[PDB]
Amino acid sequence: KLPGDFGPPRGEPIHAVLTSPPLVPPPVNRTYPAKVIVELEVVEKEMQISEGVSYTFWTFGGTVPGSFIRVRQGDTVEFHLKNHPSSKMPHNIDLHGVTGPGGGAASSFTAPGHESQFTFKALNEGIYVYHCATAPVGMHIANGMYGLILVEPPEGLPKVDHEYYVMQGDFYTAGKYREKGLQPFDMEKAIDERPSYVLFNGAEGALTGDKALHAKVGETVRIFVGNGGPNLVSSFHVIGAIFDQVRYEGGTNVQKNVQTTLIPAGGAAVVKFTARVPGSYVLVDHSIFRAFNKGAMAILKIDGAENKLVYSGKELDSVYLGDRAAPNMSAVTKATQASVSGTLTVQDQVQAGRALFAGTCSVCHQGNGAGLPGVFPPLAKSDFLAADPKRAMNIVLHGLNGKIKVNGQEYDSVMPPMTQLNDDEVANILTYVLNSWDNPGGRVSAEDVKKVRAQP
Amino acid sequence: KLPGDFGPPRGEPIHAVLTSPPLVPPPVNRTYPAKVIVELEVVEKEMQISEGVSYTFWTFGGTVPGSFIRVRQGDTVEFHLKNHPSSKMPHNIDLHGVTGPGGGAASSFTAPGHESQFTFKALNEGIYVYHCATAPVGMHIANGMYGLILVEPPEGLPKVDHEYYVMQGDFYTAGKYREKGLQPFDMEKAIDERPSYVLFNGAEGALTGDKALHAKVGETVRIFVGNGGPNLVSSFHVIGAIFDQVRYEGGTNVQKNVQTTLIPAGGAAVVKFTARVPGSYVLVDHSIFRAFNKGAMAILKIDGAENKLVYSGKELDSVYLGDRAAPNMSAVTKATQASVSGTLTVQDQVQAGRALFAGTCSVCHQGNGAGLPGVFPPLAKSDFLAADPKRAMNIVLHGLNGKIKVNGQEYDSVMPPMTQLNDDEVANILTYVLNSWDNPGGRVSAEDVKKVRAQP
Amino acid sequence: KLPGDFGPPRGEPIHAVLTSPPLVPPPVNRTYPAKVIVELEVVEKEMQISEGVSYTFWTFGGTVPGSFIRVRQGDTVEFHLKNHPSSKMPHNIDLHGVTGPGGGAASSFTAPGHESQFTFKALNEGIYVYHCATAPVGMHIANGMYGLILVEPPEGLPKVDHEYYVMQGDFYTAGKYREKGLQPFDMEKAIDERPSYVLFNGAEGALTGDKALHAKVGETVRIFVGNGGPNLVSSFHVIGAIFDQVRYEGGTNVQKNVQTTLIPAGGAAVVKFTARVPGSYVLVDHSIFRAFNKGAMAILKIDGAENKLVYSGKELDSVYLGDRAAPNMSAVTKATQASVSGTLTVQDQVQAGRALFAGTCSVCHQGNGAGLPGVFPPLAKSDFLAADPKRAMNIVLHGLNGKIKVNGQEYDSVMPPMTQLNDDEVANILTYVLNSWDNPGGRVSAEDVKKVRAQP
Numbered sequence A, B, C: 001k002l003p004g005d006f007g008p009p010r011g012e013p014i015h016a017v018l019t020s021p022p023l024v025p026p027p028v029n030r031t032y033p034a035k036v037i038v039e040l041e042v043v044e045k046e047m048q049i050s051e052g053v054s055y056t057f058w059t060f061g062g063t064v065p066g067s068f069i070r071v072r073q074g075d076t077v078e079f080h081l082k083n084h085p086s087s088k089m090p091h092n093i094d095l096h097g098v099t100g101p102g103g104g105a106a107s108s109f110t111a112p113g114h115e116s117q118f119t120f121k122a123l124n125e126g127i128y129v130y131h132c133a134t135a136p137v138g139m140h141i142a143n144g145m146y147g148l149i150l151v152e153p154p155e156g157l158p159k160v161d162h163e164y165y166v167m168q169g170d171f172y173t174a175g176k177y178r179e180k181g182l183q184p185f186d187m188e189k190a191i192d193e194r195p196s197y198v199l200f201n202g203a204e205g206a207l208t209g210d211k212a213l214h215a216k217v218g219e220t221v222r223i224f225v226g227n228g229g230p231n232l233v234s235s236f237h238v239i240g241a242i243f244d245q246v247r248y249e250g251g252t253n254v255q256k257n258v259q260t261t262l263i264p265a266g267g268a269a270v271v272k273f274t275a276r277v278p279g280s281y282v283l284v285d286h287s288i289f290r291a292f293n294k295g296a297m298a299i300l301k302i303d304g305a306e307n308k309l310v311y312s313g314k315e316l317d318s319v320y321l322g323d324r325a326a327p328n329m330s331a332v333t334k335a336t337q338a339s340v341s342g343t344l345t346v347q348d349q350v351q352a353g354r355a356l357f358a359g360t361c362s363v364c365h366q367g368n369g370a371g372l373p374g375v376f377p378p379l380a381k382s383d384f385l386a387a388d389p390k391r392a393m394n395i396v397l398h399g400l401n402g403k404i405k406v407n408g409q410e411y412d413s414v415m416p417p418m419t420q421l422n423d424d425e426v427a428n429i430l431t432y433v434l435n436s437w438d439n440p441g442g443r444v445s446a447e448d449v450k451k452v453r454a455q456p
């Protein structure tokens, strides 16, 4: 027989349990093959890809990644795809692990306001990517149309304390990283494989701060990890920990005791972790500019007792987590809304600036602006700043080097340029600095920075 | 002893059987080591990389990839490399799996009109890439100078019903994707790893349509899969199927039951597939813009009985295969030749347009131009089109959104821009539309589109 | 218990042995767990990244990669990080394989002139990357802040004849490849993952020529191979040889008998090789333009007896090693220093030109300039050259094709353009040619070439 030769469906039909990221449906917990009815709906919708940055996502079930599907090897799946009448595009679905043309795409073409159905037997056990396969296929995937389906072995996977759902994607906006507003899809960047954002679960901060994943010392954690692409291959890594097991798709090979593992575009793996020490453990794409310049960081936060014989040291994790160490950056979202409304206050700028200053400026000038005498000059009550507060704009954009004096002390060092910061970010950061630590006050506007950036 | 320690060559010398892609030489079918004489000739030649697009390829044996070589572990190989007198460049060969300096490159330097020879023992069993290694090495490989050599284990590989030869490459043209004419090699794009085409077996459509690979339900298929690069790593994937086995080079590890697998630049693998359901199964690089925007798709077509218990559904595979669902796009080749000759007719444009309309326009407007009332407006007998047929050029190039009325019906939707289409493609598509479904007729020229594209 | 549960530290504390690339510390050779004290110092310093090209590296222990650390599974490590007072930036360390927040980064933040300490138990056996994790993390890694730590199994690794240390990195300069002078870090190229150099051990030629690694026929060689990134994934390959074993990090899986293997960004592997035939064996990133256009080549040179039954052929390895076949390119370094001083002589140019002519020109015109009658025209005593020595600049920059006559002989062929060469390189090469083989003499300057390059 073929694989998954376990007998005809038995019992009543089961209406499948779909879940939203980062959660997973429960184990099916049964010893017989069933007829499973799956109902999934496409919705096109604006969501925030970053604070104050909107994007028109195309979604399976209202989220990126799409709703998680869970069935048993040998089940017969009757798949119903609906396309909501508000959609502008037609859509379909290709499930990896399906035995048949297009993995379903050939049979699931669905116009706005319509519904399609096709039936397949789940012959192949494993974790699998699904995605839209409507021309132009790359545009549909780039807009968020991907998720995971798990096909369990007949005895089920081994029990663990937590199961989570994490999926990487590369995204292509017309504007640069953190440029505010509604950002269109950019076909030219996509063809060139030059993404502006690389994310877990559809947004910067989706899994950081108050949205981190949780477990306790001693517990086991399984993560179902997808790479929707469309184009990038992930050097997938956990900072400060190790994977007990890594298994790709439905493969017979299992790797154990590794920290860094390559996930193909369109690939999926199951990883297992055992919590040993408290703190924040970071999932990244270790093609490092993705993790630290484009959004590709997620957090598993572990609580419980210290083990000083295993790890003993201070805990200053803002040095690398930067502006994602805090619970959120909601002050930036709020300042951006107020600016669009024409109601932006000095305090709106101050609080947005405070959020952005973490990492970006604090690593050298300190969280309190004091710096370090002779090494990093102070921003707190800075005579150099007060002497020409406008020159601060050029210093942020283009850097500063050479001999200077600040609060009666000599410095001869190098502050690198930070031209990648957007006009609103520079304005908000400097407004924060002017209104803290007994500095003179006032404000800097995005338009002020735009003028300075444009000077030859 | 070393590996492959099977004794001295015995019997008469064997003159090796070389084959052209996508075919493989027969199994050697012998139990003793032999002296094998290999004769391979370099030829530089123009071929079509895409319909109406010519390129000067550099080849081993007249094809891209080059002729397939098949020997037994423990054989002594006497390798003769000839460089045809029509060649402009010198050439050589590096075979992966050879034990010695440059894998042969050090001993096989050959000027136009000359011949070289060197001898090696095949110590290492496996599938291996060979390629040119003449400075500048990257240029030689980018021009097509790569292929595969199989070194069999002494007992031979297990029997299968079919063996095929498929090799990925990245290519660098001065012009953009599908821009017509003789296209030079582009060194700047190559250094930046920004290819214009990513292909199987040296051309768009090399393995699609009437050139697809074949098998029947129940049969086993082995594919020898190479990645010549020069630069890209393939997220190699089969749509709608699974690999029974994947084995890299001569490695001891074998992965089983996977659908997606990473092939390094310069790497090679042997994959095995068992046919279960009829239809078209697609080999792709799942870095998806390569597969659907740059040519990286090949087809295995399976015939035999349906199995409705495994897969039951409609078969509209043009939604993702697009303009490669048809047997070929020969109308485009012909229209391009006629244009170069100054003899391009309206009907030449109509038939080229018909070929290009599949996927590109048909996914929303339908194959018959009827659209879908209230959702996608008709192109068939379109009053909006007839009212200003020239405005159609701007609509294709730059998109259309907002409220419009077409054949007495309101629409308020979004047609994305399609600026990547070349001037001849837009002209031919629109000429097809004007001369179908009782539209007014006439024609649009490439020069008309060039003028509109250049407007601010 | 956890892993590495071998008992409390015993004996006196051990002060750890650190080594500079390409060497490794000795095996620890002990049967008990110890307290190991590690002292490592950050130094920021200018070094030559290529001949006549300086770069400001940020280093662990004065080298790129940083000092190699070697401990035993179950050891307690007391880690002291110092930042030299000459540093301008703060720094820290993340060791892969550490169980705890940031792999240490959270506890090791260290300002210029300061020292930090933290303690960890080495629970996980394997080879692991360490690196700086100070915001902006990508800039710190791109500047050279990475190395390897080995955690031995309790019984030690199997004995071999040689152990070596090789680490790949991608680098981002404002200037182009081989443009002379002090080159700043380029943030824009880094974000886009578009490196100007891709190197082993921090420089072009670090492991070629007189700096090659050595072994003899019959000996075993272990290489500890890292990929510091920040961004690239290596298609890591040995030309003309095979790896007996490849093992990633501390993984349970071991691959055997492969030639090409994918190393993730931030990944590390241990490879094993047995020398079988004399000659130069080349370690490369087989994303080929990295190996042959950006510096990603290193050499293992094997001495001993020939084995003509395994490999029999000539040895012209300059056809692919090009300008790295020679012991060094010190003439280029010297010509660049003299030019900066205003003391550049004709002979300085001649010797720099001689070094650069290897591969670049010699593959077609020969090492003696004679060419090949009717196929490649001579540069030796060339009447065509003497007739208009200035036209030689355009020929190098923009190529030459069509019918020409040279020393009473007809040619109708194609010399590709070589625009990637810098102004000093073209000037030096042509000065070499003018002063060899009874050509007229004189000189060409970098300023002459700059003027010609700028002509429309």
Ligand code: HEC
Pocket: A360, A361, A362, A363, A364, A365, A375, A376, A377, A378, A379, A382, A384, A385, A392, A395, A396, A400, A401, A402, A403, A404, A406, A411, A412, A413, A414, A415, A416, A418, A429, A430, A433, C089, C090
């Ligand atoms: C990596 C270190 C570093 C980072 C990050 C950094 N700075 Fe600086 N900054 C310096 C150094 C060093 C100087 C002194 C330059 C000199 O000696 O010529 C400086 C000088 C300045 C000055 C002028 C002198 C003074 O004390 O008033 C201002 C204002 C300033 N920085 C603001 C900022 C702001 C705002 C940020 C973040 C957006 C930032 N800096 C990020 C190192 C840094």
Ligand code: HEC
Pocket: A089, A090, B360, B361, B362, B363, B364, B365, B375, B376, B377, B378, B379, B382, B384, B385, B392, B395, B396, B400, B401, B402, B403, B404, B406, B411, B412, B413, B414, B415, B416, B418, B429, B430, B433
């Ligand atoms: C993804 C959907 C989609 C694709 C693909 C697409 N179109 Fe359209 N097209 C539309 C929609 C929707 C409109 C109506 C726009 C509006 O409501 O403002 C439209 C409008 C038009 C119109 C003007 C209205 C009419 O019916 O005459 C023309 C002409 C047209 N398309 C031609 C084409 C051609 C030719 C192609 C391919 C080259 C193409 N379209 C591809 C969705 C699409």
Ligand code: HEC
Pocket: B089, B090, C360, C361, C362, C363, C364, C365, C375, C376, C377, C378, C379, C382, C384, C385, C392, C395, C396, C400, C401, C402, C403, C404, C406, C411, C412, C413, C414, C415, C416, C418, C429, C430, C433
């Ligand atoms: C791949 C082959 C190749 C390489 C590499 C190459 N050349 Fe040439 N070169 C030629 C050919 C062929 C011609 C003749 C062109 C023709 O027939 O129109 C030529 C012509 C010339 C000429 C003019 C004719 C003569 O003999 O005086 C000069 C000068 C020259 N090359 C110099 C160089 C220099 C200097 C280099 C390296 C920097 C170089 N070439 C690299 C193939 C090459």
Ligand SMILES: [Cu+2]
Pocket: A058, A089, A090, A091, A092, A132, A133, A134, A140, A145
């Ligand atoms: Cu879709």
Ligand SMILES: [Cu+2]
Pocket: A094, A096, A131, A266, B286
């Ligand atoms: Cu897919």
Ligand SMILES: [Cu+2]
Pocket: B058, B089, B090, B091, B092, B132, B133, B134, B140, B145
């Ligand atoms: Cu060649």
Ligand SMILES: [Cu+2]
Pocket: B094, B096, B131, B266, C286
């Ligand atoms: Cu190779």
Ligand SMILES: [Cu+2]
Pocket: C058, C089, C090, C091, C092, C132, C133, C134, C140, C145
């Ligand atoms: Cu650092």
Ligand SMILES: [Cu+2]
Pocket: A286, C094, C096, C131, C266
């Ligand atoms: Cu790391």
